[PDB]
Amino acid sequence: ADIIARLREDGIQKRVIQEGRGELPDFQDGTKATFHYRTLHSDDEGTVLDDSRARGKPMELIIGKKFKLPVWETIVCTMREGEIAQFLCDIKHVVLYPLVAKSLRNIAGHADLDALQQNPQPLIFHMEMLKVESPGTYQQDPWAMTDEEKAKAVPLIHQEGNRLYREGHVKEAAAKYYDAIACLKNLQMKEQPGSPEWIQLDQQITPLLLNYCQCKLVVEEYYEVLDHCSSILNKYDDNVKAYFKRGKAHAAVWNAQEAQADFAKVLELDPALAPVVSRELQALEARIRQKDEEDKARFRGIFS
């Protein structure tokens, strides 16, 4: 209706510098608005404590799931696409400022944003919007998705990560697998343990965890692979791939006995593929013999 008339009575006074383009958006429960911000102290000292457009770091914003701070949502409500404006805010709204800028900039003891902890006062806010889209057009990120839709979106992330791995990229594939694993694990919390649904959720995470282990192994990060393979084995103790990956990781970090035991379990569980395990054992033995020869050199006349 008239949201500026509501804002002015709400206690926030604003001014428009350059009006935006298009039409006012609905901004219903769940809407993304990518925009820049530049906060500078109104009158206490006049400096700039935080900045987003100064160094080119837009602030991705979803409009109103909870967003404990109400001020930013209302601020972004009264603008359209491609609009820039500046304004102040009363102390009653940003009285919890230290809980916002504590890590939003570091993650990517501040002496600038903490001035309000001792002297709260009006604070200017320079917003600059670029795009504003409702859910359904942009790709929703996993944390803010609903369980019903994520239960169907999980396979897409799996296939995307698989394609990325085959195409020759592992870090991005590792991240995709990590996100899919996080989505699946979070879902398990909704069901009771041991129930058939819990097991069903647990069956489709094993392939993703195995893929993540394989991706980590290619990156030369073996202790994480050991941890994850051990976690799989403690519950299944029948996965040939898990045992193979665990043995390979053990051999990488010079865990000879455990690697040999894991490969032996692989053989006695799925004897079909002997030659691969034999080649792995022989390579490990050659490496161990070379290192033993080298040590024989180090340890020579150590006493005489």
Partner: protein, 637 residues
């Protein structure tokens, strides 16, 4: 109408109750008879004080014990005041009638006389062992009569025509067939020594050895009745030797009195050496005994003094303490807590006073340092005063020990805490890796090399307002400069990757890997978390026979590995890890260093053979002794 009656008593069952349900130990019959004889002697002495003519039938006040094995009789003879016929019939024929009590009431005020006996039933204990009792008495203004009875409901009184006793009384007990043991010399000596040791008259014993050898049983006087300022240390020592049967004198003595609603006197001694069975559990605590009017009542039994002060020998004597019908325990036993408070206060005062004489306190501490630390572990009210008695070796002290007060006086201006290390021995703690930086900076470290020391520091959180800090625990804070802080930050930044790698290698062996602030020459060390047992405490706890293994998980601390940035080995390790993190040499060296630090920090390996095998392998090395499905298996799904 309303009828009124007077209370009655049925005599036969009353006598049965007195003989069967009052006294549990039969030997106390001799105590009661000796008490009666002493009361009679007190009466005659008091009467003769003002009328010397009363002591014309005999001037010596004494008691005799005369066993007669042939007749199976025991005779107790005293030269006291005696009884008249009316006195015989009233005092000895009436139950719960006390002539001593009436004598006391008939007396004036402020009389220097204190007599045992106010119940009027003690005499009938003679029927615990005697089938028949005969009493021959002779008062000054009366004739010599004989009193006889078998506790059968009646007694006979008749004039006695026998050996004229000058004055006093004579009790003859005709012992039962099964109570003949009381005619033996050793049994009588034991009973008299236990119960009537401080009687104010010579208890003589007559035996046939032919001739009648006399064995006097009252040699030692109750010296505690005298004023403390009129007793020399020689008499104190003689009394202590008699009391404890010790060939050497006492170390210290505390003689004090208490006045008021609760009044008593006490005499407490400190032995020169600890007895070999001091802490043995099956050791009756008769170290302190309670007397009422110089008659033994009960032993300490951990009620007159705390368990950790059991090495103190002494006597507690009172005049007005309400006893139960048997004279071997108090009525309203809550009184024992007040006496305990007074005794503990005075013992602590004695300990504090002895600390001024250095050699004597050296001997005392060598003897009973364990007891002070046990008290600190156990007693919280006196914890502050006990902590001032502790003496320790320090890094800055020679062969002589020092107190925590001397340590606090010598503290540096920037120092805020007392530093201590607990270990197996002085040599082990002095040369350990935990005290390198602390000793190099000039600070002082207290050495605690006894298993009991670990129990004490668990309760001594602070002293003189300064907290005690262990150098084998994590988070050791030392005063420093800004340059030291910047250098430590530089080292932390430089060695972060190595610490991460070592933590990865030793995942479950330790909880954290960090940069040390206390190492100089060693490459690393292992410290425990602030809460939980230290290495030494864990070692001591795991060696306890009566320990519950199911609860060690709740008490053990976690291990942190601290590495020394300035050591060549750590620098080479950092270089190698930067070059190649998966180097086998680095992993082997990390494991070996962790094992060495674990063994050098007071811990024990879960399997020492692994360390032994590593060493043997090093020695041998030194001596020169010795298809298409492959891709399909590890590609996707």
């Amino acid at each position: 109408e309303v009828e009124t009656f007077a209370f009655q008593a049925e005599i036969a069952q009353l006598m049965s109750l007195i003989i069967n349900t009052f006294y549990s130990n039969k030997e106390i019959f001799l105590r009661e008879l000796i008490s009666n004889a002493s009361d009679a002697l007190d009466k005659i002495r008091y009467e003769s004080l003002t009328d010397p003519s009363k002591l014309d039938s005999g001037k010596e006040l004494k008691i005799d014990i005369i066993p007669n094995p042939q007749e199976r009789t025991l005779t107790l003879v005293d030269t006291g005041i005696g009884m008249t016929k009316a006195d015989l019939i009233n005092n000895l024929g009436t139950i719960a009638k006390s002539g001593t009590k009436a004598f006391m009431e008939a007396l004036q005020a402020g009389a220097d006389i204190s007599m045992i006996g106010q119940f009027g039933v003690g005499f009938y204990s003679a029927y615990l062992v005697a089938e028949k009792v005969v009493v021959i008495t002779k008062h000054n203004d009366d004739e010599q009569y004989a009193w006889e009875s078998s506790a059968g409901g009646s007694f006979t009184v008749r004039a006695d025509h026998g050996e004229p006793i000058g004055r006093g009384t004579k009790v003859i007990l005709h012992l039962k067939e099964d109570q003949t043991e009381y005619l033996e010399e050793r049994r009588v000596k034991e009973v008299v020594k236990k119960h009537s040791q401080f009687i104010g008259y010579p208890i003589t014993l007559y035996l046939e050895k032919k001739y009648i050898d006399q064995e006097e049983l009252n040699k030692t006087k109750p010296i505690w009745t005298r004023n403390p300022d009129d007793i020399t240390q020689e008499e104190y020592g003689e009394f202590y030797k008699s009391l404890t049967n010790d060939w050497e004198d006492h170390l210290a003595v505390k003689h004090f009195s208490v006045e008021g609603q609760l009044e008593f006197r006490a005499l407490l001694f400190i032995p020169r050496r600890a007895p070999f069975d001091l802490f043995e559990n099956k050791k009756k605590k008769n170290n302190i005994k309670l007397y009422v009017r110089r008659v033994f009542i009960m032993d300490s039994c951990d009620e007159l003094i705390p368990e950790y002060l059991n090495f103190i020998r002494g006597v507690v004597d009172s005049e007005d303490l309400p006893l139960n019908i048997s004279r071997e325990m108090l009525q309203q036993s809550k009184i024992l807590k007040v006496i305990r408070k007074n005794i503990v206060k005075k013992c602590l005062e004695l300990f504090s006073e002895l600390a001024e004489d250095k050699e004597n306190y050296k001997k005392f501490y060598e003897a009973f340092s364990k007891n002070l630390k046990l008290g600190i572990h156990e007693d919280s009210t006196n914890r502050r005063r006990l902590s001032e008695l502790l003496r320790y070796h320090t890094s800055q002290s020679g062969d002589e020990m020092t107190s925590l007060s001397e340590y606090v006086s010598r503290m540096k201006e920037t120092q805020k805490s007392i530093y201590y290390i607990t270990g197996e021995s002085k040599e082990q703690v002095a040369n350990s890796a935990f005290v390198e930086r602390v000793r190099k900076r000039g600070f002082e470290v207290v050495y605690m090399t006894e298993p009991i020391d670990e129990y004490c520091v668990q309760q001594l959180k602070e002293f003189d307002g300064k907290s005690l800090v262990s150098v084998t625990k994590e988070g050791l804070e030392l005063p420093e400069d800004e340059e030291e802080k910047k250098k430590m930050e530089e080292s932390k930044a430089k060695f972060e990757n190595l610490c991460k790698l070592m933590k990865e290698i030793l995942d479950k062996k330790v909880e954290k890997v960090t940069i040390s602030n206390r190492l100089v020459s060693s490459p690393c060390c292992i410290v425990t978390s602030t809460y939980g047992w230290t290495a030494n405490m864990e070692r001591i706890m795991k060696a306890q026979a009566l320990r519950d293994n199911s609860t060690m998980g709740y008490m053990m601390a976690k291990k942190h590995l601290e590495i020394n940035p300035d050591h060549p080995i750590v620098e080479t390790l950092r270089q190698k890890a930067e070059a190649d993190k998966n180097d086998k040499a680095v992993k082997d060296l990390v494991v070996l260093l962790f094992e060495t630090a674990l063994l050098s920090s007071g811990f024990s390996l879960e399997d020492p053979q692994t360390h032994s095998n590593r060493i043997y392998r090093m020695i041998k090395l030194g001596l020169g002794i010795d298809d298409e499905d492959a891709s399909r298996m590890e590609e996707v799904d």
